[PDB]
Write a protein that holds these residues in place. Structure first.
Motif, mmCIF file in Angstrom:
data_model
loop_
_atom_site.group_PDB
_atom_site.id
_atom_site.type_symbol
_atom_site.label_atom_id
_atom_site.label_comp_id
_atom_site.label_asym_id
_atom_site.label_seq_id
_atom_site.Cartn_x
_atom_site.Cartn_y
_atom_site.Cartn_z
ATOM 1 N N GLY A 66 3.063 2.627 -5.521
ATOM 2 C CA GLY A 66 2.835 3.070 -6.641
ATOM 3 C C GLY A 66 2.212 2.329 -7.881
ATOM 4 O O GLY A 66 2.555 2.191 -8.969
ATOM 5 N N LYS A 67 1.050 1.578 -7.567
ATOM 6 C CA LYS A 67 0.163 0.937 -8.487
ATOM 7 C C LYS A 67 -0.708 1.947 -8.993
ATOM 8 O O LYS A 67 -0.696 1.854 -10.366
ATOM 9 C CB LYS A 67 -0.336 -0.164 -7.679
ATOM 10 C CG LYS A 67 0.365 -1.045 -7.081
ATOM 11 C CD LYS A 67 -0.461 -2.162 -6.115
ATOM 12 C CE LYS A 67 -1.541 -1.406 -5.409
ATOM 13 N NZ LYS A 67 -0.978 -0.610 -4.338
ATOM 14 N N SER A 68 -1.549 2.622 -8.427
ATOM 15 C CA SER A 68 -2.595 3.648 -9.051
ATOM 16 C C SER A 68 -1.681 4.760 -9.658
ATOM 17 O O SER A 68 -2.175 5.099 -10.637
ATOM 18 C CB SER A 68 -3.355 4.352 -7.849
ATOM 19 O OG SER A 68 -4.157 5.136 -8.539
ATOM 20 N N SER A 69 -0.498 5.211 -9.325
ATOM 21 C CA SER A 69 0.290 6.146 -9.818
ATOM 22 C C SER A 69 0.576 5.520 -11.319
ATOM 23 O O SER A 69 0.860 6.341 -12.190
ATOM 24 C CB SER A 69 1.345 6.502 -9.237
ATOM 25 O OG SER A 69 2.053 5.602 -8.494
ATOM 26 N N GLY A 107 -5.105 2.836 0.626
ATOM 27 C CA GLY A 107 -4.767 2.256 1.613
ATOM 28 C C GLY A 107 -4.128 3.175 3.137
ATOM 29 O O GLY A 107 -4.540 2.803 4.028
ATOM 30 N N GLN A 118 -10.166 3.848 -8.157
ATOM 31 C CA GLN A 118 -10.652 3.319 -6.981
ATOM 32 C C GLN A 118 -11.214 4.320 -5.788
ATOM 33 O O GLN A 118 -11.448 3.770 -4.731
ATOM 34 C CB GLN A 118 -9.203 2.683 -6.167
ATOM 35 C CG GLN A 118 -8.474 3.887 -5.687
ATOM 36 C CD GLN A 118 -7.325 3.104 -4.723
ATOM 37 O OE1 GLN A 118 -7.566 2.317 -3.941
ATOM 38 N NE2 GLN A 118 -6.153 3.577 -4.753
ATOM 39 N N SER A 150 1.004 -1.258 -0.087
ATOM 40 C CA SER A 150 0.014 -0.111 0.183
ATOM 41 C C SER A 150 1.045 1.229 -0.049
ATOM 42 O O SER A 150 1.796 1.191 0.706
ATOM 43 C CB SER A 150 -0.738 0.047 1.293
ATOM 44 O OG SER A 150 -1.479 1.304 1.289
ATOM 45 N N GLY A 151 0.910 2.009 -0.955
ATOM 46 C CA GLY A 151 1.663 3.114 -1.230
ATOM 47 C C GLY A 151 2.750 3.025 -2.191
ATOM 48 O O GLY A 151 3.749 3.830 -2.101
ATOM 49 N N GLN A 186 2.085 15.348 5.117
ATOM 50 C CA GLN A 186 1.843 15.070 3.797
ATOM 51 C C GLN A 186 0.155 15.430 3.599
ATOM 52 O O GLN A 186 -0.716 14.948 4.490
ATOM 53 C CB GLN A 186 1.883 13.835 3.429
ATOM 54 C CG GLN A 186 1.677 13.382 2.000
ATOM 55 C CD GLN A 186 2.202 12.113 1.578
ATOM 56 O OE1 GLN A 186 2.721 11.108 2.323
ATOM 57 N NE2 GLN A 186 1.977 11.507 0.165
HETATM 58 N N1 LIG Z 1 0.482 14.144 -5.568
HETATM 59 C C1 LIG Z 1 1.245 13.389 -4.926
HETATM 60 N N2 LIG Z 1 2.265 13.937 -4.510
HETATM 61 C C2 LIG Z 1 3.267 13.256 -3.741
HETATM 62 N N3 LIG Z 1 3.183 12.026 -3.469
HETATM 63 C C3 LIG Z 1 2.301 11.495 -4.075
HETATM 64 C C4 LIG Z 1 1.120 11.995 -4.747
HETATM 65 N N4 LIG Z 1 0.118 11.123 -4.760
HETATM 66 C C5 LIG Z 1 0.756 10.022 -4.417
HETATM 67 N N5 LIG Z 1 1.670 10.222 -3.796
HETATM 68 C C6 LIG Z 1 2.311 9.111 -2.982
HETATM 69 O O1 LIG Z 1 3.095 8.109 -4.100
HETATM 70 C C7 LIG Z 1 2.972 6.775 -3.379
HETATM 71 C C8 LIG Z 1 2.191 5.786 -4.182
HETATM 72 O O2 LIG Z 1 0.737 6.402 -4.108
HETATM 73 P P1 LIG Z 1 -0.338 5.593 -5.057
HETATM 74 O O3 LIG Z 1 0.441 5.074 -6.426
HETATM 75 O O4 LIG Z 1 -1.644 6.556 -5.427
HETATM 76 O O5 LIG Z 1 -0.760 4.326 -4.094
HETATM 77 P P2 LIG Z 1 -1.158 2.988 -4.571
HETATM 78 O O6 LIG Z 1 0.296 1.988 -4.819
HETATM 79 O O7 LIG Z 1 -1.931 2.474 -5.403
HETATM 80 N N6 LIG Z 1 -1.527 2.164 -3.150
HETATM 81 P P3 LIG Z 1 -3.033 1.940 -2.335
HETATM 82 O O8 LIG Z 1 -4.067 2.937 -3.035
HETATM 83 O O9 LIG Z 1 -3.001 2.398 -0.827
HETATM 84 O O10 LIG Z 1 -3.367 0.475 -2.676
HETATM 85 C C9 LIG Z 1 2.425 7.292 -1.605
HETATM 86 O O11 LIG Z 1 3.445 7.070 -0.822
HETATM 87 C C10 LIG Z 1 1.526 8.280 -1.971
HETATM 88 O O12 LIG Z 1 1.592 9.046 -0.741
#
Ligand SMILES: Nc1ncnc2c1ncn2[C@@H]1O[C@H](COP(=O)(O)OP(=O)(O)NP(=O)(O)O)[C@@H](O)[C@H]1O
Ligand SMILES: Nc1ncnc2c1ncn2[C@@H]1O[C@H](COP(=O)(O)OP(=O)(O)NP(=O)(O)O)[C@@H](O)[C@H]1O
Ligand SMILES: Nc1ncnc2c1ncn2[C@@H]1O[C@H](COP(=O)(O)OP(=O)(O)NP(=O)(O)O)[C@@H](O)[C@H]1O
Ligand SMILES: Nc1ncnc2c1ncn2[C@@H]1O[C@H](COP(=O)(O)OP(=O)(O)NP(=O)(O)O)[C@@H](O)[C@H]1O
Ligand SMILES: [Zn+2]
Ligand SMILES: [Zn+2]
Ligand SMILES: [Zn+2]
Ligand SMILES: [Zn+2]
Ligand SMILES: [Zn+2]
Ligand SMILES: [Zn+2]
Lengths: 703, 703
Positions: A35-38, A596, A86, A32-33, A588
DNA sequence: TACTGTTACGGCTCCATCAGATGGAGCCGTAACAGTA
DNA sequence: TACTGTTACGGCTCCATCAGATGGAGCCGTAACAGTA
């Protein structure tokens, strides 16, 4: 054949290069966190939609909700993409099942076009210049689709302003119709719009399929009835035939709302399109997940490519390619740790998800369950919502799990009745409980703490420090310094949400946002205060060598050591560290938190309260958007809480959380109005010994 | 692998079933009016866009210009589609090159964001709350993208209302800038928005690529400069680097406008998308067509499928699959006559296009050319637009063709100078001629008739009967009947566009249109008059056994026999029959006419005028949207007109029309400002003997 | 007497719902007027 | 004297250009008040 992404550096990605095969089932796992959604939603979907909406109308691009261009070099092999994100919020008192699925707009059009008006005073047909009934001297206004909607003054009931409820009781005038009497006189087939809405979905589909219309009206309504029937058929096929179009969207469960959102955006029957699904199995039972997997495999068989970011084991066991990110989370992850088939991920030592799948890491199942200690609290005559007068006794001092398919009444039973009654009896809350006879055994507890299943609210004015409540203690400590005392500073000077001690060039935002008009807005750092959110006068006051900006720009692990002699602050930071957020900063913004991480912040907000030694912990699906490691940590802390001498009840569809429980109560045997009966009640082995419920079958399969 | 369409019955299609392979170059040939546009644009593109825009925002679908659902059963193997239609109108005094390509919106945003305001009275920088210069006491308003546009009162010049010209002369105040003085003081790099617009495209691309900006402004403008450079690069690559962004779209030529429209919608670089091009080679020379073919093959190589409805021989010789419709046109065609590779179409006896390609039918080339009879008219000092002081003598009594690439000045030479001077001298028109010295030989002619190259106007109030002018004679004949005379009827009673003798339930439309709100409007037949457009009183008056509805619902062939003793009516109907429209009805609405049929109606409007025995026929690209058979018929009638003793000049890129000419005048040697010189002038053999011009090379290749 | 829980009030941000207006060109119908045969 | 061309005026239709508003829920900060240890 492949989608090639090079130099992807959006958010926390460390300039990774990944090739995603086309026309395949590809899942994106990881912590969780990490970088999947990003990687998926913020980059691939954004580029795919941006490269296609430009070949459309120029004016309509503004209303499409355009996405910012990702910080990427070049993407090859892209294709147009539809995605379901999501992030779900819902909870609107002006949105119903009809408006969410847009069937209500079609119904408004259908009633405005081929409806049969009347006068609501005598019932005689109204005929016309002025469209009035000459007998009662009442002049009906023009018939338009905007007069059959309650969100504008033209068609909304004056008494309730189109809300339905005006002590929460149905509106005396409209009786929940939300529309004025004039707009309720237009009938098709003998029913007005409200009556057709009140009909069940299955009933309404056949009502529209068995409508007798003149040759004139069929020509007009051919392009409307077909679409209405298609949407109703989608809703029926998804497994939600018991709903009515007049139900508010603020009352739908998580599974029902998720299935409604899934059924709308999937039935298009295109080809050569990338479908991106972000956590498609929230609030869904195992059978719902299996149905969704079958539907998604059918959708891929048309010739599409699927990119689904899933934490569940079932989704990853039914895929042809797994992309694993990590190896950690936050700033400690963002790389492609492992890739390949599920066997390769199992055999890959560097993949945490593969480690959990292979069995190298697992959630320990206790050898002997904790038998009840002779203390029970019983509820009798549970008839809230769709509960069919059932009585269940909930044990005390053990870990209890409430299972059952979506709609079975798990929330209606536990949350409403139990939590509202316990909070009214113990916390002296002013809340109306559900429909039940009585509860015996309240005198066996001292306090009740609950964690609702609704997602948290996002705003740039909130961070984990303010959400958990530790920021107030930190500000008080800062205001207690000698320099602050001699300067007249108060605790309100040290908050960036209160004017007076904040950078006035950005009002404490820290970054100025430049407003475009037909393009996504841009964010640039401030210049006056360099993004420290505070002016020079505030930053001069230092406690233990750090000013407020430095204490707001430190991770949880660092603040754990920094705040050691303060009991409250140390307790709250320790809880935040325990739930798993040991790497994120203390300031943050909420809007930048993953799903998550926001869920874990919400958990740590309530798990940090003082326990009286005999307390009630009610959790509603805590393991939503959490990896197996976060689930393991949550199970550990909950079991420690139980061992301390407290009672915990958890309404979870997660099988790993269920398999460690001490006493399982099952609701069913089917969703919707067909359920509300206690299928099974006993220890996990006893429930596995029952073949009447699917939960028992799964439990006996995994054990 | 295939796109399967079953039961396609839109418009005139006779329930055909066709399979169109994917990832291939597929052309749709056939006659004019046979059902190519209805098969491709109205059905496949409509379904492909409808099945994708539903998976987007609900509000923005209204502004997308949705297409009505086709009358089809089911389409399999569909995919999202972008199409460029065959209907171009242009001719707007408020649209320029900047707004058409949307680069002007980006420039407005760029100037509103990182501009540098000044006071237009002293030039000193303006700084602030109010953005005012304290020296001259002038308060500049807020800076927004809507203040840099001339289509709203905020940014439009008061004198000309943003038109540029206020005797047609440039505006005295703005000098053609179209914006007020306040909005012309915001400069970037030393130039305001008007100066940047006045720069050539090639110059402006390097001006933006060599801009020195601060680190602050680059962050804001990174997402704007890249898009501006991409659009400018597309314009440069298409072959239009000599244009300036301030040129009005009402002055662009056919080829330039078509290339501008092509370059905008092609550069997206997607995959698995069907591209539909409807007549992509109007007003384009052979070299422009070859460049377009190369670009389209490159676009297909990415993995797309192309559906191009083309009449040109070059396009059909560079394709892998040909779908031929027919075998006739109008109600006499609509079936899939032949399919397969171009060799199969050549060997298919039932395909008219294959017959023309194979050489079984051809346009006859005269054995001996018609030498000039010693009569010439000469023009000297031709300097209109981009003509570099050239002099040419146009012969008389022979068929003359004017060739040359797009932008060479063919229109500027022939149309403007020759037609305007001849019409002012002979027809006593009040028209300002072009810039030239004098024309010698006007006394050798009697009248001048021209056919402009602009497409005709479409409206439901016009049909071929009204357009050709024969309807006035028919109405006079009907009003001359004894019953009409005794009833007091006039010729204005018998027209459905004049109130008094028309069905008031539809105002003569004949079909009521029901107005939806977020869906395409529906059309249903009238009920009061059954769609006869006239009431009972009018329909009682009959001439020769037919009332006006029966004479308005008869084909051209039938009306040719019905009107035999009336000279004017017979002449006009005979011309309509000769141009090729022997199957369409006498009252089919203009909005339902195909492009080729509308073009032929326009031709027959002017070719039916009385010839004096020595007349001037100026034709501007007559063979646009016409099959080879229509071209053959037009060449035949034009050669008969020449043999009658008249002079005809034709500005055509069609090679078959050129190869039959009697004297060719060539303009070039390149498009844009680099051309305007007479490359060659002589008989087709002599021009083929010259290798300096591509036209000579093609002529010598085909001969 | 201090900690912990609740409730009420004001300001800030986000999500869901809702279904075009204006300006100018082209065409039809009608009247007036001039050249020509 | 009749045919053919041009020009002016009023109404109808189509195409190009232009770049969101409103209502309610959730959160932060602050004050007031009660139970408990
Ligand atoms: N706009 C932003 N600026 C800086 N950091 C960010 C930003 N958006 C997301 N993050 C960080 O990037 C990391 C990955 O976030 P994100 O990719 O959205 O989550 P994920 O992997 O899909 N996890 P989860 O949604 O909890 O299952 C996390 O540490 C976030 O806090
Ligand atoms: N106010 C209401 N009026 C009528 N029906 C309701 C209302 N609230 C809930 N329901 C229905 O009652 C049933 C049980 O709801 P609920 O107990 O919230 O579901 P759940 O078992 O928790 N399912 P889920 O959360 O998705 O796993 C569902 O069919 C709901 O749609
Ligand atoms: N709305 C309509 N109603 C009735 N007939 C129509 C309509 N639209 C088109 N048609 C006729 O259908 C036939 C085919 O038209 P269409 O398919 O648009 O032409 P096309 O084959 O592309 N030819 P062209 O554009 O001239 O090269 C013609 O006879 C049209 O007049
Ligand atoms: N009013 C104008 N001002 C400036 N440039 C003009 C104007 N009108 C036309 N041009 C340009 O003069 C050149 C010749 O125009 P034109 O003679 O109409 O082209 P053409 O040879 O007929 N080409 P096409 O019709 O496409 O085959 C082109 O570059 C036009 O853009
Ligand atoms: Zn009445
Ligand atoms: Zn009401
Ligand atoms: Zn600042
Ligand atoms: Zn000044
Ligand atoms: Zn001006
Ligand atoms: Zn009618």
């Amino acid at each position: 054949d492949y989608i090639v992404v090079k130099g992807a550096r959006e958010h926390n990605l460390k300039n990774i290069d990944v090739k995603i095969p086309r026309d395949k089932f590809v899942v994106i796992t990881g912590l969780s966190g990490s970088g999947k959604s990003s990687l998926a939603f913020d980059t691939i979907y954004a580029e795919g939609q941006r490269r296609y909406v430009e070949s459309l109308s120029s004016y309509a691009r503004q209303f499409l909700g355009q996405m910012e261009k990702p910080d990427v070099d070049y993407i090859d092999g892209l294709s147009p993409a539809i995605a379901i994100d999501q992030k779900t919020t819902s909870r609107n008192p002006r949105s119903t099942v009809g408006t969410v699925t847009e069937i209500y707009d079609y119904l408004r059009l259908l009633f405005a076009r081929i409806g049969t008006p009347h006068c609501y005073l005598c019932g005689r047909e109204i005929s016309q210049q002025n469209f009035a009934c000459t007998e009662c001297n009442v002049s009906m206004e023009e018939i338009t689709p905007r007069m059959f909607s309650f969100n504008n003054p033209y068609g909304a009931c004056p008494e309730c302003t189109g809300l339905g409820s005006l002590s929460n009781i149905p509106c005396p005038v409209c009786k929940g119709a939300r529309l004025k009497k004039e707009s309720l006189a237009v009938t098709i087939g003998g029913k007005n719009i409200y009556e057709v809405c009140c009909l069940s979905i299955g009933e309404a589909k056949e009502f529209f399929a068995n409508l007798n219309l003149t040759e004139r009206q069929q020509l007009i309504a051919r392009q409307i009835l077909k679409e209405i029937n298609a949407r109703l058929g989608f809703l029926v096929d998804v497994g939600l035939d018991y709903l009515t179009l007049a139900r508010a969207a603020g009352t739908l469960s998580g599974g029902e709302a998720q299935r409604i959102r899934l059924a709308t955006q999937i039935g298009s029957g295109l080809m050569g399109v990338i479908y991106i699904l972000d956590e498609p199995s929230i609030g869904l039972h195992q059978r719902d997940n299996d149905r969704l997997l079958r539907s998604l495999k059918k959708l891929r068989d048309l010739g599409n490519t699927l990119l689904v970011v899933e934490h569940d084991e079932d989704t990853m066991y039914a895929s042809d390619y797994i992309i694993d990110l990590g190896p950690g989370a936050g700033s400690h992850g963002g790389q492609i740790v492992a890739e390949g088939t599920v066997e390769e991920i199992k055999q890959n030592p560097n993949s945490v998800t593969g480690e959990y799948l292979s069995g190298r890491k697992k959630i320990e199942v206790p050898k002997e369950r904790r038998k009840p200690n002779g203390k029970w609290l019983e509820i009798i005559g549970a008839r809230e919502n769709n509960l069919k007068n059932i009585n269940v006794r909930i044990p005390l001092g053990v870990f209890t799990c409430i299972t059952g398919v979506s709609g079975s009444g798990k929330s209606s039973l536990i949350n409403e009745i139990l939590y509202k009654r316990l909070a009214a009896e113990l916390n002296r809350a002013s809340v109306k409980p559900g429909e039940h006879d009585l509860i015996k055994g309240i005198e066996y507890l001292d306090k009740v703490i609950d964690i609702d299943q609704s997602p948290i609210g996002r705003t740039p004015r909130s961070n984990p420090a303010t959400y958990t409540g530790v920021f107030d203690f930190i500000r008080e400590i800062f205001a207690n310094t000698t320099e602050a005392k001699t300067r007249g500073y108060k605790a309100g000077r040290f908050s960036f949400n209160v004017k007076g001690g904040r950078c006035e060039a950005c009002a404490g935002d820290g970054i100025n946002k430049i407003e475009m008009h037909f393009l996504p807005d841009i964010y640039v750092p401030c210049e006056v205060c360099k993004g420290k959110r505070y002016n020079r006068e505030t930053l001069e006051v230092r406690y233990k060598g750090k000013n407020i900006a430095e204490v707001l720009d430190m991770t949880v692990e660092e603040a754990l050591e920094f705040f050691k002699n303060i009991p409250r602050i140390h307790k709250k930071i320790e809880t935040l560290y325990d739930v798993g957020l040991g790497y994120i900063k203390l300031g943050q913004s909420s809007t930048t938190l993953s799903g998550g991480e926001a869920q874990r912040v919400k958990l740590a907000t309530e798990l940090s309260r003082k326990s009286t030694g005999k307390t009630m912990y009610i959790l509603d699906e805590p393991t939503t958007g959490l990896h197996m490691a976060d689930v393991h940590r949550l199970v550990g802390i909950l079991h420690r809480l139980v061992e301390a001498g407290n009672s915990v009840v958890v309404i979870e569809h997660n099988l790993d959380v269920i398999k460690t429980a001490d006493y399982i109560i099952d609701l069913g045997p089917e969703g919707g109005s067909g359920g509300g009966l206690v299928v099974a009640e006993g220890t996990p082995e006893e429930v596995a010994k029952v073949e009447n419920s699917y939960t028992g079958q799964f439990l006996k399969k995994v054990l």
